[model samples]
Structure formats: C-alpha cells, structure tokens
Target: ESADLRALAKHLYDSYIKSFPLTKAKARAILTTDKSPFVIYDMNSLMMGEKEVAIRIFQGCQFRSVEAVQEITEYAKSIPGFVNLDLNDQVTLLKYGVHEIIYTMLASLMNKDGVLISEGQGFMTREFLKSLRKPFGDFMEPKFEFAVKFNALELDDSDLAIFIAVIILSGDRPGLLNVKPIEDIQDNLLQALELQLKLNHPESSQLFAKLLQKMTDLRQIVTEHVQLLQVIKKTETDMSLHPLLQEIEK
Candidate 1:
C-alpha cells in the first residue's frame, strides 16, 4: 500500500493528540494550519552577517581564539543564570565589560563616539574621521618627536587591530568582520590611540544617556543575530548566548 504523506502526518499528529488527551482547543492547535514557514527567512542573511562580525572582533582583538571564548565565558560566569538574561541585559553586560577593559588600559578615556550608532558608513564620516584623526596625530607626534616620552608607548599593528575590532564590535553593525586600516598602524601605537579615544572623547552626561538608548537597540539587533545563528547551526548555543532560551516545552 502506498503511504500518503499528508495522511501519515495527520495520523501521527492525531495519535499524539489522543495520547496527550488535549482539550478541543489544544487538539485544534496541534493540528492547526500555518500560512507561513515557522522561521522568518527574510531577515536571516543580515543576522548571519552580524554574528560573523562578532566572531571577527573576538578573533582579531583577542588574537587568542580559545582564550577569548574562555575569557568571555568567565566574565559572564559571575551572574546568576546569566544565560537567562534578557537580550538588552546581555548586551549591557558586553558593553560594561568593554568599558571596563578600556578603562583598565587607559583610565582617562571617555564616551566621545558614544553618540554615533556606526551603522553602515558612520565610522567613515568626514567629521568623525577628522575627530578620530586628531587624537591619532597627537599620539603619533610624540613618537616622531623623539622627545623624553616613553618610546615603548608607540602604536603597532596589533594595537590597531584591537582598536578597530573594539570600535566595530562596540557598535551595532555586528557584521563588520575585519577592518584593516587603509594605512599602517602598529600594535603598541594602536593601543595608544585607543587610550586617546577614551581620554579625549568622554561623552557628557546627557550624551551618555542618549548613547545608552542606542546601545539597547544595538543589543536587540544582536539578539536577531543570535536567532540567525540558531537557524544556521541548528544548535541553540552556537556563536551566541547559551541555555534557558525561553525555557519549557513549547
């Protein structure tokens, strides 16, 4: 006998419904029709790109892929049920950690670029770049001057890599995988530039408040990125927060 696929599915669902002893409404739900696919396909591509950007930032900045994962895991370990944290809370944790790291490296840095969302081409704007260029030039001056300053405090490739990584990851365009500067930047020197961004550009209290809203929105976008990862990997934990994701038997 040839098995009819639709009849077979219907039988299977009906049997499950009978076994569960569902109410009329529950039975209807179990056999309910859906006009669309369970997953949202259209937004998937953009979300995947954003996740890729996060991976790139971690790789480029930490240069310790394995260690970076461990570091991130450890950083969030202190929170009870961190996995259950809401999307905005999760993003806040990431931002707070980044803020702490920047401060650790250079206590004087502030919220200068906090106002810009950095979506699309914001990072490359003329005025923003001008502001970015100024501090860079200031830091470089000491290196070229050969003055009594610490020669050891120069920027280098690694530093620049981390700086760019931080800038991109710190923003909402989560898919900006790698951003190699158009020009040369050394590791140590890049470190100096990051310090410069912090020290010279700390945002005003009002500005910081506005930036917080942007940060929350950024987190929402990342949550979408996480969902995209779920579809791509078919695993709940891949490339995003793990566990208690909505909880229970739905």
Candidate 2:
C-alpha cells in the first residue's frame, strides 16, 4: 500500500539482480546430461594417489567466497546509510556480515543436490562435499543443512534484497562504534522489508519470520566458519587462503 516502500523494494531487487551473478536465476542449464561439469566426477576416475581433490574444492569455494565479499561490498554500499557508518563499523559489518550474506545468498546458488560454483561454470555434488577430510569436509555441510529449509521459503530477489540489508545493518557485529544509529538505519530497512513481504506475499505467508530465523541460523553458520578457519590454520596451513579472507577473518 505504501508507494515509497514499493519503490525501495524494486530498487533493492534490481540492485541484487544486477550484480549478484552466481545464482540459479543468473545461471544457464549447465546441468544437462551432456558433459556434466561435476568436479568430483572427474577426480573419482583418476586412480593416481587419490589426489587432493577435496582440498581443491575447498580452496575453490573459498576463492569464490572471497570474490563474493567484493560483490557484497558493492551491494552493501547501495544500502542506504551504510556508507555513513563509521569506517571501523563499516569494515566490521563486512567482516562479520559478509560470510552471513554469502551463506544467505547461497540458497539461490544451491539446491537439494549440490551448489553451483565458479559462477555456474561447474557443479559439486553434495555427496562429494561431505566426503572431504575433517574440518574441510565438516565445515561446508552446515550451509547445506540451512539451505534445504531456506529454499523452501521461496522468496525471490525482492525479498532477498531487503533481507540481506537487514543482515548488513545488524548492530551486533563486533567493534561497532555507533550501534544506535546503525540500528535506526536497520529499522528503516526492516520497515521497508515488512511491506515488501506483504506485497510479495499477498496470500499471507510466514516468509518474514521464517527468513529472520534464517538470519539467526546464518550467525551459527558464520560461527562454524570461524571455528573451521582456526582448525585449518592449526592443522593445514598448506591450504592457501586469499589475503582478503584472512584480513576479514581477523
């Protein structure tokens, strides 16, 4: 019913569609039976020393996730008042929020089987993902666990746009210098989001609450990420982390 909220939703949705390029909506049908792009499928055939395929997949996912941070940076800048936050808090929001946004946006990149990666250049099986060695294998499974129920919500780009802004404006990130002002900005986004939901779900769905619950789950997902990052550091320093990933992990 509110024209302003409607405008905000479309603006945000268009922004999401414009730049978030690794989603199902953005991908072509690479899944067709001819010449599947499954990474695991190729390695399973190579009987040579059971090569470090798992670690490669982990590294691959990490590289793209770091790039997604760059994309998320651009997306965050579009969120109103985001740039006005203290520089420390802006970095802090990204540090804490990037992975959560990555995980949140992952729903569109994944399905019941596996997640698309390299911007749909290839696919990795869910079965293959869980087959990795400890910490490497264990880390990714939780994201899939979250996405299964999350994808069921069936919210589109418009819904995701406001939802993602809420994640970024969250005042709970560590080292935030201006929590009140940040929360107020978040309040405006949430107000837009409530109306965004009403217009998107005229039949009265529970998408909004269900979505907020996923935000809570995303925190837990990020927790899993940090825990695993430490384990990777202590156990397998051989795996290279993008400098940006390490900086943000800091």
Candidate 3:
C-alpha cells in the first residue's frame, strides 16, 4: 500500500488520455477528408482579405489553444500532490505553465511543414504561418522551432503526460509562497521521469539530458512570446485573444 513513483507515473500517463483525447486517427481523418489540407491560407484568406483573415485565424487558434489550456489544468488537478498546494499557487503555476503544456501538446499534431490546428480540424502550413505579418506571426515561429525538435524525440502521450506535470509543478514560478512543497512533488516527478525514460529508452544515456535541456528551450520560447505579445498589444490592438489568455498574459 506504499506509493510507488512508477505507479504515480502510470497514473499521470493515464490522466493524459482522459484530458487530451488527440490520437493518430483524428489526425488522419483530417488528412484523408481534404485534398488541400491547409485552410488558414489561400482563397479563404483571399476572400476575407488580409486584416480580417489574419485576425480570424488568430482568434480561432487562440480559442482552441484556450481549450488546450483547459486540458492541462485538468491534467494538473489529477496529479496526487498538486492540488494540496495553496490554491493561489495552483493558478500561478498554471498561468506560467500554460504555453509550455500547449506547445508540447502541439507536437502530437505537427510536422516540419505544418501543424494541424482548430482541434485537428484545420491545417496551417508553415509557409502560411510564416507569411503572416508582425505579432500574429510571432507566436508560431518559436512553436515550430521548439516542436520540430520535440517531435523528433518521438515521445508519445505517456512521455508527454509526465513532461507536462514537470512543467506545471516547478518551484521557480514567480511569487510562489509554498515553494518547498512544490519542489518535493517535483522531485518525485523528476525521479519518475528519469525512471520512465531509463526503462523505455534504455539504450540512450543522453536522452534524459536532452529532454531536460528542452525544458530550458521551452522557457526561452515563453519569454520570447511574452515580449512579442506585448508588442502585439501595442501595435496591433485589434487582434483579440481568449479571456483566459488575456488574463494570464496581462
């Protein structure tokens, strides 16, 4: 009846399945149904014209990202010790960690050329994303930069389940009052991540370090996103965001 880190890891893995239900089948469905898969470009935008087209794509993607944010929230609450922290830090950690979870989740639906968006019902090719002007274009650059390498690791939902937990339970998030408890839970999560990786990726000693380095990579992307987004609010006041994003980013 003792708690095992392995068991804890298993619980976290199962939690991902419930929280974010994306799978290969759903991605393949989008691929098969449309001969010309990317929708956030071409005549769809030609008709809507440049400004509305960009804003519409931005709005649609942000709301879908808000849903992705919600799933990470659900995933975090299910981790055994996470909910025990002061509820204030719960929001604080989530506020800071939302983009990391979301960017990680995007890997499952992305390729080097494009990423499936709008809950996997739409595709936005990288060229189209890169072509958008200014701040609306800024976010996707880091995501593709990060995810292209992340997806190369070929980590499935189980790996991601633990990785997402690691992102949210950090002791380093600003203004945390209960840092010690956060670190303790995170230590166990990190141990479980090491254990899981060693078991599943036994042949590679460096994979653990590589993945940890990717955590730093994720943090830098978030920092860049903040600076770029601030510029958006200043220069492109018309571009709207989901209330959750507006609250968290502000």
Candidate 4:
C-alpha cells in the first residue's frame, strides 16, 4: 500500500473509463440523439493525455466568445461520482499525474473571470487549431462539434492498425495523406465517407452533425480522423518511451 499501488490502480481505473470502446459507444450515442452543446474530448491517459477536461469544454463549448473556467473546474470536480467516494476508496482522487493535465487544460480554457473556459485556449486556441482552419473558424467557433480521442488498453499490432485506420477515417478533414489504398478498392480510404454513410451509430453521427452544423465539408471530419490515426501509428514506431508500448514489432 505504501508503494503508490493505490495511485497506479486509481490511474488505471480512471483510464479504463475513457478507453476507445467507451468513446466509440459515446460517439455512437451522439450520432442518433442529435444533441448540441457537446464535446468528443479525445484523451490519451497512456501518455498522460488530459481527455476528460476536453469533454467538459465540449459539453459547454460556445461560439464567438467562450465559457468560464470555473464551469470547467466544476465539471471536472463533478464528473459523475468522481468525488463521492470515501477516503478509503483509493479511486476518490487520481494519484497519477492525470488530474494535473486535466486541470491544466481547464486552466488553459478559462479566462481571469473564473467561468467556463472560453474557446481562446486549450484546443480552442487560434494557434492550436491554425491548420484545422475550417472547423476552428466555422464549427468550433460556433460551439457546434463533438470531440473523439482513441487509446488502447494494451498496444498490439492489429489493434494499432485498426486505430490508425479509424483515425485516418475519423477526423474533420479528408484527402490529406499519402496512405493510398488500391485504386480498385471499393471500401478504401477514398470512399470512407460513403462507407460510413450507412453507420447506424448515433454518437459518431452526432459528432459530425454537431460539427457539420457549422461546416458542410465532411472532408474535414474524415481528414482529422486520418491525422489522429497516423499520429498513433507513428508514435508506436517513434515513441519508444510510451508506457503501454512494451516491445517493437511484437
């Protein structure tokens, strides 16, 4: 108990809450509900990525201006039974540096007034989304988009490949990469939109509808997913220090 196992366990427990499966399920829900004022909030707790706070900003995203940071903090603090645990329950508060990044993103999102974070900082910053011009200016600035981040419980080749393919196919942009599929491949990346055209998943559909609310180009959505997937794939090769990545070419 003295070795920070509590912290490790808590960290793992919290991470398990936002894994890709959960995000996928959530995305599926939003696809059908047609809800607004939401965020996809992609997170990478494996690398200590702050995803939960991302969700908070998404839930309260606004247009033109931004929400107050206090709202974000309150959201973080009120993450559905996060604080209701007894002190004996190690899961009460995160011991891994997770809350640090979560709060950091929250702090970034807030202004001096202490309200929900505005769209000025965090992923909402002009500089951060500079390249994602379309969504930043049209969809996000209008507070009409969903967030999605992918992380695996354990790193495996097949899983990593699927992650890459989904990321390649999931973002807000399209036709921006060189990972070309066979020209005759009916279900290649090129036809990804058409392929997903029939998705019955409500959350994934909703994420786009919210984003599409501001920008009509499904290309941007497709492109963003591609970038995220490539990022994960490249990281597996380059980021050897990753916690879950144990061996190469395994």
Ranking by lDDT: 2, 3, 1, 4
Off by over 4 Å in 3: 1-3, 23-51
Task: Tell me the alpha-carbon RMSD of every candidate.
Answer: 26.6, 3.0, 3.2, 19.1
Provide TM-scores for the models: 0.22, 0.89, 0.88, 0.20
Among all windows of ten consecutive residues in candidate 3, which has the lowest summed lDDT? 41-50
lDDT tens digits by residue: candidate 4, 1-250 = 2234233323333443333222223322333234422222333321232233322332343221122222222333323333443332212122221222222223223222221222222223332222332322232321123121111121222222222222222222222222222122212322332223223233344432332232222335434533543454564344222221112112
Q: For model 1, how does the per-residue alpha-carbon lDDT over 1-250 read when each residue is reduced to its tens digit?
A: 1124233223323432333221223322322343211221222432443344334332232232223333444434332234354455445445433322322222111112211111111111122222322212122121122211211233222232233233322323232222232111223323343344344345423332232233343334334434443453453245442222212101
Best by lDDT: 2
Q: Lowest summed-lDDT stretch of 10 residues in model 1? A: 114-123
Alpha-carbon lDDT, every model: 0.29, 0.78, 0.78, 0.28
Q: How well is each residue in 1-250 modelled by candidate 3, as lDDT tens digits?
A: 2248689879998887888877544564565435334355553544443256567677777778788888888989998788899999999999989987777777677777778865665677788877776667667877888888987776666777887898899999889988999999988888888888877788877777788888888878878977876787788776665678888875
Compare the candidates by TM-score and give the number of the best one.
2
| Candidate 1, residue 37: how far the Cα is off, in Å | 43
Q: How close is candidate 2 to the true structure, as a TM-score?
A: 0.89
